[PDB]
C-alpha cells in the first residue's frame, strides 16, 4: 500500500504511493500499491546518502550550478574526499 | 587616431552584434566623437539577445561617455533587466528540464539540437564556457555530417571572439578539412551554402592573428558571390577588401596578374570595390603615386578595421616596398628625382627608405 | 526553483516536489497524491505564514537557494487541524574531531 | 556507519531472511502481507551491517536456493509431457521467485557490487539471477535432454502429424534447453542444437525427401511441388509451436535442396511449359 523507511535512529519516514518519483530507490521497494530498513550503520552515512539522492534526482542535466555537497569542517579535506569515503 | 571615412550606416545594416560594439571600441581607442549614438543603438541591441551583463557594461561605459558628455554636447531599464534575467534563468531551468525530457525522448537530433540552442543562449548570455560545454556535448552527439558542420559553424561564430587559435583552429579546421566537405559535393555542388566562405573569413581572422597572411589570402581567393550574408562577419564589400588587399599584399606579380585579375570567383567582389580595382590598375601599371596615395588613405579606414588595424601597418609597408621594388627592377640607372616624383617623396628620405631596403 | 521539499518531523518526513510558480491548493492536490487529502478545509501551516490554498510561492520567493532540493525552506505541513504544525525535527549529523586518515 | 559492531548481527537477520526467502523460493506464494514480511526482511538486512555478513548471507541464500532446486529436481520426477508443463511452471515461477529474491537482494547488490565483488576462487559475488541459472542448469541435465527434448521431437512428429502435447510444456522444454545452457550464457542456443537438432535435421529432411518424393510421383508433381511448398509451411507451423532460432531456418531449405535433386529438370521443363502454355499460378509457386 504505502511504504516506510526505518533507520538505526528511527527515521521512520512515510513514503508515498503515487508521486514518489523524487525517490529512485524506494520506488523499487514499493510493496504495494513496506518496512524498508537500513539500521546497521549510523545515520551520518544514511541521511547523507538520502539527501545526496534528493540532490542528485534534481541536479542532473544542469549546465548551471551543480554544487559540491557541504561536508563537515574538521573533514573539510573530506569535503572532496567524501568521493573517497561516503559519496558526497 | 580619428578617420571620418567610415560607413556606420552599412555596418548597422550589413552587421550587428559585438563588432558594432567593438568598432566603437577602436573609436573608444582612437577615433572619438563617433561613439555615443552607436553606443545607444548597441545598448538597444543588447535589449535583445538575452544579454544583461554586457547590457549593464554598455550602460556603464555609456555613463563613462556621459561623464565625457559633461563636455561634449544612459539607459538601464531595470524592470527589463530583472524581468528578462528571471525569464532567462527560468528558461535555463525549463531547458534543463527539457534536456531531461528529451533524453527521456532520446532523439539525438533533438537532444544535440538542444545542446546547440543552449550554446546559442549562452552566447546570448556571453557564457562562452557554458556554450563550450553545450557544443562540447553537441560535439560527437550528432546524426549526420552536415550537423557536425553546423556545430562547428556555431563554434566558429564563437571563435570570432574566442580567437584562441591552438584548438580554436582545431574547430576551424574541423569545419575546414575534416567533414569531407558536403560529403564530396563542395557545399552541395556549386556552393550557395555560406560555409566555405565562412571558412575564408575564419582563416582570415586566424592568420590575421597567427600572421601567416599568405595562406590567409590563399584561402580568401575563391569566395562565392552567391550568398554574401551574415550580420556579424560577412558583408561582401568588407570581405572583398579583406581578400583583395591580403592578396595584393602577400602574392607576387606572377600571381597578381595570374590569380588577381583572373580571379573570377572574386571578380564581382572587386566589382563591389571600385577603389581597390583602381589601386590594382595603378599598381599593375606602376602608377605608384596615386596608388600608394589611395592605399594610405584607406590605411586609416582599415585601421578603423579593428582586426586589420595592427596588420595594415605591416602590410601597406610591404605594398609600398613592393612598389619600390617595382620601380627599382627594370633599370641600370634611375634618377631619384624621377623616383621622388613617382613616390610623392623627397630624395633623401626616399634614400633612407631605400637604405633601409639596402640593409637586406 | 523546482523545489524538492523536505517535510521533516522526527518520523513524518515527506520528500515532495513543487515549483517556485506552484500554489498551495494544487500542492495539497499533490498531498492528495500522498495521502488523499482535500485542500478545501485544510491549511498547510509552517508556523511562519498564513498559507491559504491559492497563495503563490512567487509572491513568497522560494528560489533556488532559498528552497534547495536537498535542503529547502519547507512549506510547512500541519498535523492536520485548523491551526497546528508538524514539529520540525531537522535531523542532526555526526560531529567529528579533526581529520582522521584511517577511514579513506 | 559507526552505529554498531559490523560483525555481530548475522543470525537474527538470517533467520528473518530465510523465513522470507523460503516464501519466495521459486514461489511460496508471496502476497502483499508476505511482501510486508519481505520488508521486515529489508529490516533484517538493514539492521545487520552486512558488509562482511552479506556475502555469507547471500551464500546461505545460495545454498538454500540450490537445495530448493534439488527439491524441484525431485519434483521433476514425474510422468511424461505433464512434466513438461510442470517444468514450464517451475521455470516460469523460478524466474519470478528468484526475481523476488533479487528484489530483496537489491540492497545487497549495492552493498557488494558497488563496493566489492568478484564479478568486477569459488566465492563469486554476482546476481542471484545469474546464480539461479547456474544452480538451475544442474536441474537441466537429465530431464531436459532426456524427456523434454525428446518430447519436443515428438512434437516435431506432431508437425508431421498430430498436434503439440502442450506447447507450454514442449516449447518450455526448448526453453529449458536454452535456460540450462552455459551459465556464462556464451552459448545460449547450444543444447538444442547439439543434442536434438542433428536427429531433427536428419529425420525431417530424410522423411520429407522420401515421403514427398513418393507422393511427388503419386500426386501431380507440378502441383505436388506446391504441396511441398505447403508441407514445409506445415513444418514451419509445428516449428512455431515449439521453436528455436536455428531449426526451421536450416530444415526447410534442406528439404528443398534434397527434393530438387529429384527434379532439377522439371523445374525448367515445366517452367518452359508455362512459357509455352500460360500457367500463372504454377508460375507463382514455381517462382
Author numbering:
A (entry chain Q): 17 to 49, 58 to 112
B (entry chain A): 77 to 149, 160 to 446
C (entry chain P): 1 to 104
D (entry chain O): 1 to 120, 132 to 298
Paper text:
The CRL2 E3 ligase consists of a Cullin 2 (CUL2) scaffold in association with a catalytic RING-box protein (RBX1), with the substrate adaptors Elongin B (ELOB) and C (ELOC) at its N-terminal. When associated with the von Hippel–Lindau (VHL) tumour suppressor substrate receptor, the CRL2 complex is the primary regulator of the Hypoxia Inducible Factor 1-α (HIF-1α) transcription factor. Activation of CRL2, in common with other members of the CRL family, involves a cascade of E1, E2 and E3 enzymes, which conjugate the ubiquitin-like protein NEDD8 (N8) to residue K689 on the CUL2 scaffold. CSN5 is responsible for the deneddylase activity of the CSN.
Using 3D classification, we were able to generate maps of three different structures: (a) a holocomplex map at 8.2 Å, (b) a map of the complex with little or no density for VHL at 8.0 Å, and (c) a map of the complex with little or no density for CSN5/CSN6/VHL at 6.5 Å. The two partial complexes likely arise from compositional heterogeneity in the original samples from which the structural analysis has succeeded in isolating subpopulations. In line with subpopulation observations from our cryo-EM, we identified subcomplexes of the CSN–CRL2~N8 missing the CSN5, VHL, ELOB or ELOC subunits. An interface between CSN1–ELOB can also be seen in the partial structures of CSN–CRL2~N8 missing VHL and CSN5/CSN6. The dissociation of VHL and CSN5/CSN6 causes the N-terminus of CUL2 to shift downwards, away from the CSN. The plasticity of the CSN results in changes in the C-terminus of CUL2, which is clamped between CSN2 and CSN4, in order to accommodate this shift. The formation of the CSN1–ELOB interface appears to arise as result of this movement in both the deneddylated structure and the incomplete CSN–CRL2~N8 structures.
